[PDB]
C-alpha cells in the first residue's frame, strides 16, 4: 500500500566508525535513564530533551 520512494544515500560521518576508544573532550553527553538518576538529575535529562527537540528558545 504505497511504499516509500526509494531514495539514495550519500557520504556522511555517522555511517563510518571513529576508532575513538576513550573519547576525550567533544563527547555529547549521554543523558540516560538506565544510569538511575536522582530527582535533580532527572531534571538534567528533561532540559536536554527540551534543548534537542525544541531549540534553546
Amino acid at each position: 500500500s504505497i511504499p516509500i520512494l526509494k531514495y539514495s544515500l550519500s557520504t556522511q560521518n555517522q555511517r563510518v566508525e571513529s576508532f575513538e576508544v576513550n573519547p576525550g573532550d567533544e563527547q555529547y553527553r549521554i543523558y540516560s535513564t538506565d544510569s538511575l538518576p536522582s530527582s535533580s538529575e532527572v531534571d538534567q535529562i528533561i532540559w536536554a530533551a527540551y534543548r534537542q527537540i525544541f531549540s534553546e528558545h
Binding site: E17, E20, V21, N22, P23, I30, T33, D34, S35, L36, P37, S38, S39, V42
Partner: protein
C-alpha cells in the same frame, strides 16, 4: 506442561498436583508397634512438608531422633509433633537465624499454616510475641489460634491452602502464593526470589500489592525485577521498574494499557541479520544495549504489535502481560 482449559483443569499444571492429590492423615490414635514402613512414611512426608522440601539428611534426622518417637505415643501430630520439629536446631538453621524477623515470620506461614499473611496487621499479631515473650511462645503463637484449630483436626498433616475461597485470606494472597510456591522442585533456599539469606516479600506483602502470577516452568520464568522506590521525599531513583498504574494522556491515547514482563536479552540478537557485529562489540563506555536485563514496559493497546515484534526479534522472552 502448559494449559488452562487443556483437559478442564486450571491448577494441576500450575504446580499443585501432589498438593491436591494427597491429604496425609493418620488413622490410629497411637502408632502401633511392630511395623516400621507405615509411620516412617508419615514422618518423611512431614520432613518435606514442614521444612518446605528441604534436604533433611539422616545425619541430622538422627540428631532429632527423640521428637518423632514421643509422637508415636504421647504427642499429637500437627499440634505437637511438628511443633516439636519447629523447636529444633534444624528448624532454627533455615527459617529463623539466617534471615530477618519478618522473613522468619513470612516463611513460617508457608511452613506452619500454609498461607501468606496480608498487610502488616497479621505481621503485627505475630511479632508482638517475639519481642515480649521469647521464641518458644513465638512458634506457639500459631499453634493455638483459630487459624490452626479449625482447618485441621489434630490427626491430619498441615497442607497448602492459600488458593481457595474458603481460606478467606485476600485476593492479593493468591498472588503472593505462587511467588512462594514454584512447583514441587524448590525450597526456601532453591527459590530465586529469596534464598536462605534473604526475605521473600518485603514491599509486596506489606502493601498488599498483587503481582503477575507467572506459571512456573514456562518459557522465560527466570525473571524478577529488583526494587528501588521513586520520588524525592524518600530520596529514591528512577529507571529500574516500569510503573504499576499507567495514568494520564498516554493512558487512553493508545487504547487500554498493559504491563509486559521481559525475561532478558543478550548482545547477540539486536541486529536483524543473525549474528554479532564483529568489531569492538560495545560503545566506548562499555555497557550493554540493555545494560541490565529483566526489564519491563508500560504500553497501550495500539502499540502491543510493534513491541511484541521488538522484544522477540532481539532475544527477549516474555514472562506475562497484565493490563493496568
Amino acid at each position: 506442561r502448559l494449559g488452562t482449559v487443556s483437559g478442564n483443569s486450571s491448577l494441576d499444571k500450575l504446580g499443585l498436583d501432589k498438593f491436591l492429590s494427597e491429604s496425609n492423615r493418620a488413622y490410629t490414635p497411637r502408632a502401633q508397634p511392630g511395623f516400621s514402613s507405615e509411620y516412617e512414611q508419615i514422618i518423611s512426608a512431614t520432613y518435606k512438608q514442614l521444612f518446605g522440601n528441604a534436604y533433611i539428611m539422616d545425619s541430622e534426622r538422627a540428631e532429632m531422633a527423640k521428637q518423632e518417637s514421643m509422637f508415636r505415643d504421647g504427642q499429637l501430630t500437627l499440634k505437637d509433633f511438628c511443633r516439636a520439629l519447629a523447636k529444633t536446631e534444624q528448624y532454627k538453621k533455615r527459617f529463623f537465624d539466617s534471615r530477618p524477623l519478618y522473613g522468619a515470620i513470612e516463611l513460617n506461614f508457608k511452613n506452619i499454616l500454609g498461607r501468606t499473611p496480608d498487610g502488616l496487621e497479621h505481621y503485627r499479631a505475630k511479632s508482638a510475641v517475639y519481642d515480649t515473650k521469647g521464641y518458644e511462645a513465638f512458634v506457639d503463637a500459631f499453634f493455638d489460634d483459630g487459624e490452626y484449630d479449625e482447618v485441621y483436626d489434630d490427626y491430619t498433616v498441615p497442607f497448602y491452602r492459600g488458593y481457595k475461597t474458603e481460606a478467606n485470606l485476600s485476593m492479593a494472597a493468591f498472588t503472593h502464593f505462587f511467588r512462594m510456591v514454584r512447583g514441587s522442585s524448590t525450597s526456601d533456599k532453591a527459590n530465586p526470589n529469596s534464598m536462605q539469606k534473604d526475605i521473600p516479600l518485603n514491599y509486596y506483602g506489606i502493601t498488599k500489592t498483587p503481582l503477575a502470577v507467572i506459571a512456573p516452568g514456562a518459557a522465560g520464568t527466570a525473571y524478577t525485577e529488583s526494587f528501588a522506590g521513586t520520588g524525592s521525599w524518600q530520596s529514591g531513583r528512577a529507571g529500574l521498574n516500569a510503573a504499576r498504574v499507567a495514568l494520564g494522556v498516554p493512558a487512553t491515547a493508545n487504547g487500554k494499557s498493559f504491563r509486559v514482563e521481559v525475561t532478558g536479552y543478550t548482545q547477540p540478537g539486536f541486529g536483524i541479520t543473525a549474528g554479532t557485529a564483529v568489531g569492538k562489540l560495545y560503545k566506548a563506555n562499555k555497557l550493554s544495549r540493555y545494560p541490565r536485563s529483566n526489564k519491563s514496559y508500560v504500553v497501550g493497546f495500539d502499540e502491543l504489535t510493534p513491541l511484541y515484534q521488538r522484544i522477540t526479534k532481539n532475544g527477549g522472552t516474555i514472562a506475562s502481560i497484565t493490563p493496568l
